[PDB]
Amino acid sequence: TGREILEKLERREFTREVLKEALSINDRGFNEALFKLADEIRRKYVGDEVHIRAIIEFSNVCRKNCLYCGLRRDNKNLKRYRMTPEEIVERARLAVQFGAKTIVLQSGEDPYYMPDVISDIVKEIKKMGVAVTLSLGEWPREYYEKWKEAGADRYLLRHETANPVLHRKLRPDTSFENRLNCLLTLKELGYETGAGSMVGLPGQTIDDLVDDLLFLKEHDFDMVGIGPFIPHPDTPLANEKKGDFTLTLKMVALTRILLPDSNIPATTAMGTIVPGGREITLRCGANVIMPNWTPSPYRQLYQLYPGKISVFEKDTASIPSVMKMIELLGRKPGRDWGGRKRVFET
Ligand SMILES: C[C@H](CCC(=O)NCCC[N+](C)(C)CCCS(=O)(=O)[O-])[C@H]1CC[C@H]2[C@@H]3[C@H](O)C[C@@H]4C[C@H](O)CC[C@]4(C)[C@H]3C[C@H](O)[C@]12C
Ligand SMILES: C[C@H](CCC(=O)NCCC[N+](C)(C)CCCS(=O)(=O)[O-])[C@H]1CC[C@H]2[C@@H]3[C@H](O)C[C@@H]4C[C@H](O)CC[C@]4(C)[C@H]3C[C@H](O)[C@]12C
Ligand SMILES: C[C@H]1O[C@@H](n2cnc3c(N)ncnc32)[C@H](O)[C@@H]1O
Ligand SMILES: C[C@@]1(C(=O)O)N[C@H](C(=O)O)C[Se]1
Ligand code: MET
Ligand SMILES: [Cl-]
């Protein structure tokens, strides 16, 4: 019964069987109650502020070949770009002028910048009195150390899938063990660390989703980014099925229940598979939004998956748009950098 599973989630009895049953039950009443539970936990632990992280996707060059990703090195049907360090710093300054209190720098795994150009950019943005989050992939410990000394605050490195076998198949350059080692290094170096996964990958099972939730809970990540897999036509997974929105939403809800004081975005991928999907997600456990701040002409060239929303509008539309979103949801913009505010419990 769904009622018993809800009761067990409310009492914090997070067993593998409870999580599996929550993900397996398709009843509308159960799902809606699960979403309401997550929404209420969010409100109680992290409040009504929705934190805005402005993302600058500064290079679409990548040395890796992940099977799901439109930026994979084997994709020749993509114009590659690199923003200059001046462009990046000035684009970050514009976001700070527009009210962003975190700047996220994301790229393909592009050797050009690494490590010293990143360090220089980070130092310049940190002068602006905002948080800096990096999302640059897997690099040596030394690189991560240099970026932390340069002033970076946070690092996003989704774990993608906690099934090592599936991970290696989808990410043939690397392994789950290396991904985890990177995440543990980042945590040791004092970053606020973000993990997370895709839902609906080819070959991924419900039990794999449970393992993603247990992985996240085990490592107590500061941020958890979850979205559906969206097939990209210039990849080997072009003909695979999209991930299910509702199932993905359930993963966000369960993440909030498991990690009640974490920061959880309503991802652009959620807003891409379903119109209004980010807004739904912000009402089912999420408390962060990441407006795209990549300038034209580059924005349209950074498509990990197709259909990405926010491409046709002026490149300064996203921050005002999310501020309108936050208001029409009855929520408030973040007042500070939106770092994790831990609530120690039992
Ligand atoms: C907006 C729609 C439709 C509501 C509706 O239209 N229902 C009839 C009208 C009811 N009114 C009170 C307005 C008038 C009643 C008098 S009347 O004469 O119209 O019958 C309702 C129906 C189901 C609702 C979601 C679920 O809960 C799950 C989840 C819980 C979270 O916490 C918040 C997010 C989320 C996604 C909810 C959002 C929203 O809330 C939904 C979509
Ligand atoms: C960038 C330009 C020129 C002036 C400038 O360079 N301004 C730096 C402001 C720096 N901060 C954001 C840190 C101020 C915080 C003040 S606050 O009192 O809000 O704490 C200024 C002039 C008018 C400003 C917009 C409007 O206002 C409306 C709206 C208010 C929201 O809120 C944030 C978004 C938005 C669209 C604003 C963005 C930006 O800002 C604008 C374009
Ligand atoms: C930046 C994050 O984007 C996600 N990502 C990469 N490719 C896709 C895709 N085809 N569909 C959805 N999400 C994807 C990965 O989870 C990555 O970590
Ligand atoms: C920024 C990001 C996140 O969840 O942190 N969201 C992106 C998206 O959904 O497009 C892919 Se990574
Ligand atoms: C553009 S994908 C996200 C950044 C990095 N390449 C990663 O895979 O973690
Ligand atoms: Cl962040």
Side-chain angles (χ1 to χ4, degrees), residues 164-177:
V165 169
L166 185 60
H167 194 114
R168 174 69 173 176
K169 292 164 182 175
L170 295 178
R171 311 189 66 250
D173 307 286
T174 186
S175 65
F176 174 78
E177 177 178 5

PDB file of all heavy atoms in Angstrom, residues 164-177:
ATOM      1  N   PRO A 164      28.250   0.399 -11.893  1.00  0.00           N
ATOM      2  CA  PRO A 164      29.564   0.531 -12.537  1.00  0.00           C
ATOM      3  C   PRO A 164      29.644  -0.047 -13.917  1.00  0.00           C
ATOM      4  O   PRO A 164      30.452   0.394 -14.752  1.00  0.00           O
ATOM      5  CB  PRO A 164      30.494  -0.145 -11.576  1.00  0.00           C
ATOM      6  CG  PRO A 164      29.718  -0.290 -10.274  1.00  0.00           C
ATOM      7  CD  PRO A 164      28.298  -0.340 -10.638  1.00  0.00           C
ATOM      8  N   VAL A 165      28.843  -1.105 -14.170  1.00  0.00           N
ATOM      9  CA  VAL A 165      28.884  -1.735 -15.442  1.00  0.00           C
ATOM     10  C   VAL A 165      28.272  -0.811 -16.519  1.00  0.00           C
ATOM     11  O   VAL A 165      28.833  -0.541 -17.593  1.00  0.00           O
ATOM     12  CB  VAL A 165      28.206  -3.109 -15.364  1.00  0.00           C
ATOM     13  CG1 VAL A 165      28.021  -3.657 -16.761  1.00  0.00           C
ATOM     14  CG2 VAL A 165      29.021  -4.013 -14.465  1.00  0.00           C
ATOM     15  N   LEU A 166      27.085  -0.305 -16.215  1.00  0.00           N
ATOM     16  CA  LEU A 166      26.415   0.606 -17.124  1.00  0.00           C
ATOM     17  C   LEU A 166      27.270   1.923 -17.307  1.00  0.00           C
ATOM     18  O   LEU A 166      27.396   2.436 -18.422  1.00  0.00           O
ATOM     19  CB  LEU A 166      25.047   1.022 -16.538  1.00  0.00           C
ATOM     20  CG  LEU A 166      24.211   1.866 -17.450  1.00  0.00           C
ATOM     21  CD1 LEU A 166      23.841   1.217 -18.788  1.00  0.00           C
ATOM     22  CD2 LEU A 166      22.867   2.266 -16.759  1.00  0.00           C
ATOM     23  N   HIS A 167      27.882   2.346 -16.198  1.00  0.00           N
ATOM     24  CA  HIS A 167      28.702   3.580 -16.248  1.00  0.00           C
ATOM     25  C   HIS A 167      29.822   3.405 -17.268  1.00  0.00           C
ATOM     26  O   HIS A 167      30.057   4.303 -18.110  1.00  0.00           O
ATOM     27  CB  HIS A 167      29.239   3.855 -14.897  1.00  0.00           C
ATOM     28  CG  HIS A 167      29.817   5.245 -14.742  1.00  0.00           C
ATOM     29  ND1 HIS A 167      29.243   6.181 -13.899  1.00  0.00           N
ATOM     30  CD2 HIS A 167      30.882   5.861 -15.264  1.00  0.00           C
ATOM     31  CE1 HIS A 167      29.942   7.319 -13.969  1.00  0.00           C
ATOM     32  NE2 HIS A 167      30.942   7.142 -14.797  1.00  0.00           N
ATOM     33  N   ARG A 168      30.562   2.294 -17.209  1.00  0.00           N
ATOM     34  CA  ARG A 168      31.663   2.070 -18.112  1.00  0.00           C
ATOM     35  C   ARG A 168      31.242   1.950 -19.540  1.00  0.00           C
ATOM     36  O   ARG A 168      31.948   2.413 -20.456  1.00  0.00           O
ATOM     37  CB  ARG A 168      32.437   0.855 -17.673  1.00  0.00           C
ATOM     38  CG  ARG A 168      33.547   0.385 -18.601  1.00  0.00           C
ATOM     39  CD  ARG A 168      34.632   1.389 -18.587  1.00  0.00           C
ATOM     40  NE  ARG A 168      35.775   0.828 -19.370  1.00  0.00           N
ATOM     41  CZ  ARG A 168      36.888   1.503 -19.626  1.00  0.00           C
ATOM     42  NH1 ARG A 168      37.064   2.711 -19.186  1.00  0.00           N
ATOM     43  NH2 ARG A 168      37.817   0.974 -20.423  1.00  0.00           N
ATOM     44  N   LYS A 169      30.107   1.334 -19.803  1.00  0.00           N
ATOM     45  CA  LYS A 169      29.602   1.249 -21.137  1.00  0.00           C
ATOM     46  C   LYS A 169      29.217   2.563 -21.743  1.00  0.00           C
ATOM     47  O   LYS A 169      29.428   2.830 -22.918  1.00  0.00           O
ATOM     48  CB  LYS A 169      28.399   0.300 -21.253  1.00  0.00           C
ATOM     49  CG  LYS A 169      28.814  -1.149 -21.007  1.00  0.00           C
ATOM     50  CD  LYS A 169      27.566  -1.983 -20.745  1.00  0.00           C
ATOM     51  CE  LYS A 169      27.942  -3.449 -20.434  1.00  0.00           C
ATOM     52  NZ  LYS A 169      26.741  -4.189 -20.082  1.00  0.00           N
ATOM     53  N   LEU A 170      28.568   3.419 -20.947  1.00  0.00           N
ATOM     54  CA  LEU A 170      28.138   4.736 -21.424  1.00  0.00           C
ATOM     55  C   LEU A 170      29.255   5.756 -21.443  1.00  0.00           C
ATOM     56  O   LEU A 170      29.107   6.754 -22.169  1.00  0.00           O
ATOM     57  CB  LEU A 170      27.010   5.225 -20.517  1.00  0.00           C
ATOM     58  CG  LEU A 170      25.739   4.401 -20.568  1.00  0.00           C
ATOM     59  CD1 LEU A 170      24.753   5.023 -19.556  1.00  0.00           C
ATOM     60  CD2 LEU A 170      25.121   4.512 -21.943  1.00  0.00           C
ATOM     61  N   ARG A 171      30.295   5.537 -20.664  1.00  0.00           N
ATOM     62  CA  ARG A 171      31.412   6.482 -20.506  1.00  0.00           C
ATOM     63  C   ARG A 171      32.745   5.711 -20.652  1.00  0.00           C
ATOM     64  O   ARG A 171      33.464   5.460 -19.759  1.00  0.00           O
ATOM     65  CB  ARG A 171      31.284   7.186 -19.153  1.00  0.00           C
ATOM     66  CG  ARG A 171      29.886   7.749 -18.896  1.00  0.00           C
ATOM     67  CD  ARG A 171      29.765   8.628 -17.669  1.00  0.00           C
ATOM     68  NE  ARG A 171      30.567   9.848 -17.886  1.00  0.00           N
ATOM     69  CZ  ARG A 171      31.672  10.165 -17.285  1.00  0.00           C
ATOM     70  NH1 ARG A 171      32.111   9.524 -16.267  1.00  0.00           N
ATOM     71  NH2 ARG A 171      32.337  11.237 -17.744  1.00  0.00           N
ATOM     72  N   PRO A 172      32.974   5.397 -21.955  1.00  0.00           N
ATOM     73  CA  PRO A 172      34.084   4.461 -22.255  1.00  0.00           C
ATOM     74  C   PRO A 172      35.470   4.973 -21.973  1.00  0.00           C
ATOM     75  O   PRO A 172      36.383   4.181 -21.998  1.00  0.00           O
ATOM     76  CB  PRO A 172      33.840   4.115 -23.724  1.00  0.00           C
ATOM     77  CG  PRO A 172      33.237   5.249 -24.311  1.00  0.00           C
ATOM     78  CD  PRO A 172      32.300   5.750 -23.265  1.00  0.00           C
ATOM     79  N   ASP A 173      35.660   6.240 -21.701  1.00  0.00           N
ATOM     80  CA  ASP A 173      36.929   6.778 -21.378  1.00  0.00           C
ATOM     81  C   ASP A 173      37.328   6.608 -19.920  1.00  0.00           C
ATOM     82  O   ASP A 173      38.414   6.941 -19.525  1.00  0.00           O
ATOM     83  CB  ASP A 173      36.955   8.306 -21.718  1.00  0.00           C
ATOM     84  CG  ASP A 173      36.553   8.579 -23.063  1.00  0.00           C
ATOM     85  OD1 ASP A 173      37.389   8.290 -24.003  1.00  0.00           O
ATOM     86  OD2 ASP A 173      35.423   8.970 -23.379  1.00  0.00           O
ATOM     87  N   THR A 174      36.343   6.223 -19.067  1.00  0.00           N
ATOM     88  CA  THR A 174      36.514   6.321 -17.653  1.00  0.00           C
ATOM     89  C   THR A 174      35.676   5.269 -16.910  1.00  0.00           C
ATOM     90  O   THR A 174      35.427   4.200 -17.498  1.00  0.00           O
ATOM     91  CB  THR A 174      36.257   7.802 -17.213  1.00  0.00           C
ATOM     92  OG1 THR A 174      36.571   7.940 -15.834  1.00  0.00           O
ATOM     93  CG2 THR A 174      34.856   8.248 -17.520  1.00  0.00           C
ATOM     94  N   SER A 175      35.398   5.502 -15.649  1.00  0.00           N
ATOM     95  CA  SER A 175      34.712   4.482 -14.811  1.00  0.00           C
ATOM     96  C   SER A 175      33.985   5.129 -13.689  1.00  0.00           C
ATOM     97  O   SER A 175      34.327   6.249 -13.300  1.00  0.00           O
ATOM     98  CB  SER A 175      35.743   3.509 -14.258  1.00  0.00           C
ATOM     99  OG  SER A 175      36.648   4.163 -13.356  1.00  0.00           O
ATOM    100  N   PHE A 176      33.053   4.384 -13.094  1.00  0.00           N
ATOM    101  CA  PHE A 176      32.408   4.850 -11.872  1.00  0.00           C
ATOM    102  C   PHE A 176      33.415   5.033 -10.772  1.00  0.00           C
ATOM    103  O   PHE A 176      33.351   5.970  -9.993  1.00  0.00           O
ATOM    104  CB  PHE A 176      31.279   3.875 -11.494  1.00  0.00           C
ATOM    105  CG  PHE A 176      30.669   4.204 -10.168  1.00  0.00           C
ATOM    106  CD1 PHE A 176      29.750   5.253  -9.992  1.00  0.00           C
ATOM    107  CD2 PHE A 176      31.041   3.488  -9.039  1.00  0.00           C
ATOM    108  CE1 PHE A 176      29.221   5.514  -8.727  1.00  0.00           C
ATOM    109  CE2 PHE A 176      30.547   3.790  -7.799  1.00  0.00           C
ATOM    110  CZ  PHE A 176      29.661   4.801  -7.643  1.00  0.00           C
ATOM    111  N   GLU A 177      34.419   4.103 -10.667  1.00  0.00           N
ATOM    112  CA  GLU A 177      35.406   4.265  -9.650  1.00  0.00           C
ATOM    113  C   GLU A 177      36.168   5.617  -9.755  1.00  0.00           C
ATOM    114  O   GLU A 177      36.399   6.282  -8.747  1.00  0.00           O
ATOM    115  CB  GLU A 177      36.429   3.113  -9.778  1.00  0.00           C
ATOM    116  CG  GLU A 177      37.583   3.157  -8.816  1.00  0.00           C
ATOM    117  CD  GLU A 177      38.560   1.927  -8.954  1.00  0.00           C
ATOM    118  OE1 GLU A 177      38.376   1.108  -9.851  1.00  0.00           O
ATOM    119  OE2 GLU A 177      39.498   1.838  -8.177  1.00  0.00           O
TER     120      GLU A 177
END
